[PDB]
Write a protein that binds this ligand. Sequence first.
Ligand code: CA
Ligand code: CA
Ligand code: CL
Ligand code: FE
Ligand code: FE
Ligand code: FE
Ligand code: FE
Ligand code: KR
Ligand code: KR
Ligand code: KR
Ligand code: KR
Ligand code: KR
Lengths: 199, 199
Amino acid sequence: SLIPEIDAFLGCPTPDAWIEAALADQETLLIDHKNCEFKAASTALSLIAKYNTHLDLINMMSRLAREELVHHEQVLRLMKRRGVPLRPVSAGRYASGLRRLVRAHEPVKLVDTLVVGAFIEARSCERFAALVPHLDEELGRFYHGLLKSEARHYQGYLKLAHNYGDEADIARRVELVRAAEMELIQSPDQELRFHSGIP
Amino acid sequence: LIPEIDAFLGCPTPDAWIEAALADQETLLIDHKNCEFKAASTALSLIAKYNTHLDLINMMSRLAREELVHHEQVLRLMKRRGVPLRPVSAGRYASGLRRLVRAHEPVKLVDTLVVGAFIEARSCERFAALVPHLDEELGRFYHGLLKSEARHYQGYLKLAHNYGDEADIARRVELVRAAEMELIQSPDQELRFHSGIPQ
Ligand SMILES: [Ca+2]
Ligand SMILES: [Ca+2]
Ligand SMILES: [Cl-]
Ligand SMILES: [Fe+3]
Ligand SMILES: [Fe+3]
Ligand SMILES: [Fe+3]
Ligand SMILES: [Fe+3]
Ligand SMILES: [Kr]
Ligand SMILES: [Kr]
Ligand SMILES: [Kr]
Ligand SMILES: [Kr]
Ligand SMILES: [Kr]
């Protein structure tokens, strides 16, 4: 069943405890979300630069980066309308945690990087969906719009991993990262971030 | 205010540069492609550095998207013309100009933006020098990129004035003009879009 459904692909749902913390501090959530959109754009560019002879990756990543930059700009606009000031919010543990599972040897270092991307995007999709019933109208609508783009990016990242890797080795990678990702989501965490664990 | 391009710049593109470029248009295309990418990349690095300057962040996010569209257009054109994706290392020009930037704020930022204005202004002037010597499709593509380069030159300089200091900008402009002219007029071992004179 190539490219499963979001809840099938993921190892756990977003905890209610995370949701409660998120609702109690929507301003730091927004700030971190803004930063996540940007980071996704910059990650895409770093991939283009590392894999500069991989034409398929380059063309998908350049387009993806533009989409993520639109989202970054939209989060900024919404922050502006609602009087949310900018302030520094350092990166959470999640994406680094997953990047540590990545192997050091090409070409498998690439397929793993892309599987990690598929997980980040799948989780963002699931987590937006968990959030939107609890938000005000304009925020819920914005986040609903985003969750649909996250589902496409999840597919995009998995398709690209299959473009450069073998079914079995990917299936192995997905199993290893699934477990690591569940642990980061379910484990306790000393901070609120979009992809933090339970506080 | 904002000077016209030839007035802002310290010299025209030498005729010897143009001769070299026309004899090696595959390398020029690949480098051009890389420059569009590097411009998006630089724009993102600025957002990450100046992650609280709202005007900077909004201009730079938009600018990156536009630069990535151009990255993609040059790739399309490379594909139609059988230009392979071979690595071409970065020329001296951009890093030569950055060496001029002072280490201290808020003047490190102004400096960086004026370097930005010079790179964009030179790209505009150099595309215009090339257009009349190129085939139909390249001529039209490079002509369509002139307008945006002039606008980006405008944008960077306007943003410099947002964070300066009429006198301080004027002194920085005078200094970068000199170095930039020297980077363009001096002999260079490599053909790039922003290389100096051959030999
Ligand atoms: Ca002049
Ligand atoms: Ca050929
Ligand atoms: Cl765009
Ligand atoms: Fe996004
Ligand atoms: Fe996304
Ligand atoms: Fe451009
Ligand atoms: Fe430009
Ligand atoms: Kr939120
Ligand atoms: Kr988010
Ligand atoms: Kr996100
Ligand atoms: Kr060219
Ligand atoms: Kr260029």
